Amino acid sequence: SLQRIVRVSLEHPTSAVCVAGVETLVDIYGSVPEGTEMFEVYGTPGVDIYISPNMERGRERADTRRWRFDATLEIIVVMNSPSNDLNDSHVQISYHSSHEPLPLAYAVLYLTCVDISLDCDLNCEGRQDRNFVDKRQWVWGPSGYGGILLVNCDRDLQDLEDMSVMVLRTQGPAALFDDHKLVLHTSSYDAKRAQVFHICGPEDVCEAYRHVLGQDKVSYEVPRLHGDEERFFVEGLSFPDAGFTGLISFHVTLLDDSNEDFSASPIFTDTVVFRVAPWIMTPSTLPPLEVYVCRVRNNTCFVDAVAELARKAGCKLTICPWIQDEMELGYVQAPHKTLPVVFDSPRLQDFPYKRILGPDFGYVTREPRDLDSFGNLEVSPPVVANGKEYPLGRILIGGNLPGSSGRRVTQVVRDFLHAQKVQPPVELFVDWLAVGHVDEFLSFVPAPDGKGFRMLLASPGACFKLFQEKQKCGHGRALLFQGVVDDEQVKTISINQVLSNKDLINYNKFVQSCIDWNREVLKRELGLAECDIIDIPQLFKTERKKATAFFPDLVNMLVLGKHLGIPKPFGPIINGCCCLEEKVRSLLEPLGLHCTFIDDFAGTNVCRKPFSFKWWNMVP
Amino acid sequence: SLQRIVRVSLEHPTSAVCVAGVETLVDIYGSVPEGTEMFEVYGTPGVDIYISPNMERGRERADTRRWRFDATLEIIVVMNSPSNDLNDSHVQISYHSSHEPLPLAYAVLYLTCVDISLDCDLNCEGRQDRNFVDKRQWVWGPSGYGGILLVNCDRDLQDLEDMSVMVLRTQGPAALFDDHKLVLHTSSYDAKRAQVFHICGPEDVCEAYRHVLGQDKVSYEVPRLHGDEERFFVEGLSFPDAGFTGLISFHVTLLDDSNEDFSASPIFTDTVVFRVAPWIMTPSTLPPLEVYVCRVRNNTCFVDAVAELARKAGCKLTICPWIQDEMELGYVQAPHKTLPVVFDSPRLQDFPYKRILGPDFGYVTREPRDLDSFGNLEVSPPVVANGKEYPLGRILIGGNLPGSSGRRVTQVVRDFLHAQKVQPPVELFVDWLAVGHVDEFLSFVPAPDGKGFRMLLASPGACFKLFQEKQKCGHGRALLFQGVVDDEQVKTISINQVLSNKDLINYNKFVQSCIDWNREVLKRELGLAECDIIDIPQLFKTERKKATAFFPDLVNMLVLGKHLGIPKPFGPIINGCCCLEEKVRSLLEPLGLHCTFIDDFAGTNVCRKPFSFKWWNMVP
Hints:
Two copies of one chain form a homodimer. In chain A, the strands form twelve sheets. In chain A, strands 2, 4, 7, 9, 10, 13, 15, 16 and 18 form a nine-stranded mixed β-sheet that branches. In chain A, strands 1-3-8-5-6 form a five-stranded mixed β-sheet, with no helix packed on it. The first copy, chain A, has a five-stranded mixed β-sheet with strand order 11-20-19-14-17, with no helix packed on it. Chain A is elongated. Chain A folds into three domains: 1-119, no CATH class; 120-276, no CATH class; 277-620, no CATH class. In chain A, a hairpin with a 6-residue loop joins strand 5 (47-53) and strand 6 (60-61). By secondary structure, the first copy, chain A, is mostly beta strands. The first copy, chain A, is built from eight helices and 44 strands. Chains A and B meet through strand 1, strand 14, strand 17, strand 19 and helix 4 of A and strand 1, strand 14, strand 17, strand 19 and helix 4 of B. The PDB classes it as hydrolase. Keywords: peptidylarginine deiminase, isozyme, mutant, citrullination, post-translational modification, enzyme, cytosolic protein, hydrolase. It forms a dimeric assembly.
């Protein structure tokens, strides 16, 4: 355990402070008297005294017999309860010889015990057998521990509910603190990443929580106002980034400043270590809570369809004065509160997130060092791949090909995503698309069996097979885009005409290969097999040299639990029904999913429930 | 292993590129002909063809029988040797029914095999015998792997010996590279931490190594000049710091840009991962190679004594136009070269290190964000503490007390030291000293037994005991400072007069307690027992509330192997001999150490051999 040396003198008594539970090694400054053969030790009640050979572990009570003198023996003193008054306990070491009855000499040590401890919620409910916890460490995993700090605003009232509580216990005689001081401190590095408010009055006044640790404040002398304990409120100010691993440490040090002719000296130090909760993305397989549609007027059809879908799913709907391309809705999590946090990047000014999104919403942003769209960013369901477990899924980044002059995801955003460390990113090939969003060829829907989900991929090959099957069944003259309402630039085309267009078929073969590259990347990096993948029939055309959807992109869907909002494809009408819609239904309805095809020919984002898996139980 | 999908067509042949050893999954775009019941696969010699159920692992040869058609079966194609000409191999898949003898249809795939690999020295002499080695990872420990990059200059010819070699093998038909391109690339983050030169000519010209990857250069199209392989030389530009963990990655990507009217697409990617070698401090227990004396004139005694000590130790001596307070001599290590590196902090201009220190010397510096002296920094021998092993020792940092207005070690230096990560630092209490250097109370000397060393601590208590013993033996009137040459303000003082000075004895008792704090810190953090510690008798006096040596500081010694240069203490002369020198000899000579007491009533730094333990085998 912890040990501290206190020296005593044969010539005069000594006074010292011992922290409750800390072992005090007591020894004299000079030499024992000549002729010393034996020694005895005594303590007042409440003072535990042990002896131990300095080369052996373990100890035994020392106050019950006369010992043979041996310089290699150590005298250990422990007090477990704080003193009521200064120097209310003492220890005496008496050195003896067999020739005279009185001690040759003796040393007296007066003792004042204080109980000093700096503690936070270590989140050790059932994780690491409390009291065998190194308070200087933060340990990941299902057998770890450590305090958690939430950051609800990072641009680089009664907000106390989001802060983390830090308690300083200072039991002891008040007069001691006339010559001893408690210093709460943190490094300047950590200081510019978090701040601390000390409550100096009732819990109802807003100006009683005084800012004691902050940017330039790296140390603070604690006044003992509220008797035996002082409460502090820690507020995180920065998410983990390329230069910040997320750990924040606070220390308290008891300093002996009684010697006016000497300098101050430390007697005891305690430490609390927080980890900033990372920003976590939510895949489309998590249950929805609120759907956000942002920028459309004169588009009551879209709003009404999204509202009907949300009512069928059971989640609320909110309209705000785009939200899916310049914003991503994640969350931060602590044992005491879960906060949704929006990551913003407007391809500006201070965004009012507490009113547009909600009162319990956080905000994080990153300015470039010199993102195109958050459609370049998705995240997978929980997966296992290459022996490594990813209980919060993996972020999916659609970047640009090596050697290209343009960049889709700036370096600062990639650094932020990797610094969250809980959703290790996977790079995808999207340069073949005209826009280049991951959702244009990829989607995740919940499923009752297998891995609990299916990965949907746009597939020109599946559409080839569907059209060949329909042609063999005598429906080759069925017309695509027949269900559209007679527009001047919407010309119908038959299954035969599509299958006979060599340029279109060859281009869709190329697009299928482009998607196959990502298919194998995802199978390797998400540990997926073919039975986890559903190929959605989807054709593409060339917005010259880049791909765009031939008919509305079926996989670019809105997933609200088991209810799907799917763009209406306007495919070939066979027996008065769209065979593309029928194929999608035959593929997805067996999974218990409900398909709603919405007429699509401006942005939608969903706030979802967090993962059931707690991020601090992960081992990255 | 790695798998890539290549689609074929029943209507026309397909041409594709396969990387040697990579599994190619072959499947058609559309549907098989109606009536398909069976299939066969054939390949030209050198093309391995297997089948595998897509839900099962493992494979078996597919070209020896007629199979029943089953859509869940996968056809796997492997080529292990590069092609000599384009499309020199092919595979045919024929679909059959039992009714007609000819295939209902067939698909032809022409194949060109290329062998592409980006490789570095993975330092896999043993520990792994690479067959499960992820080239995208750098693994610590005695069973790890990964490239190592050396940095010989960090301010934030034939330099090929310090660079790391990276080889790109590109075997294949030349005509393929008329439509396919090799792109060597790295992230901008890594780009501004390292550079890469491509050799584009003979190995004797200095302008043939063209700068191909650098600060703004994140991608480079590789020309195949030297036939089957190209050589690149990687030079690290930044040590690990608070914002750089030390990993540098390079990738090569083969891009298909043959398909006109389409966009380029990736076919293969390979990766090399380097770790920058950290800066490592050398404790005084490591063997010396060269002693550096810097700044003194008119003191031939100091230079002559250091030269005699170095001659007895066997190490060179060098004088240069301070070196221990503003510079620290560590080293960086790779399997191919070990470089001593100076960390500089001039309490200026570009310091010429290759001439003042030596040709094989590196340089590191850190500007403050707004250290007092490198005497605030020491390092321990290898230790084991709290179950954790520290095979390169632990750095010792003498900082200021919490709440003090001054700082001894700036935050940038602490961040650098912690970011090296291989010598986890320990904080020590030095504010009680007038100067505040760790060496004023601490030293490490080699020892033949125990842990292989002894930690020496200045100890007023040991001097108390020595003087009490000498007084009891009748030598109380022996005079300190009798060996002085009768200079002004240098008054002799007897053992009795020292022991009878209550203020001096009390102040040295306080100093002993200040040292005891560090004694317990070091015992805990270095896993030391009392048998590892030697208390050197040392008295202190007060420079106005701060400690300075009463007589010359014995523990502030120069350790050259088993030869010790110890400041001459000028202690009490008993029987014509200094009893302090005699006590130090009785303490240290049994360890096989040779004590030379040097008149010290100028800076000295030592360049030492590196640790025998290789840093990459550590698990931090």
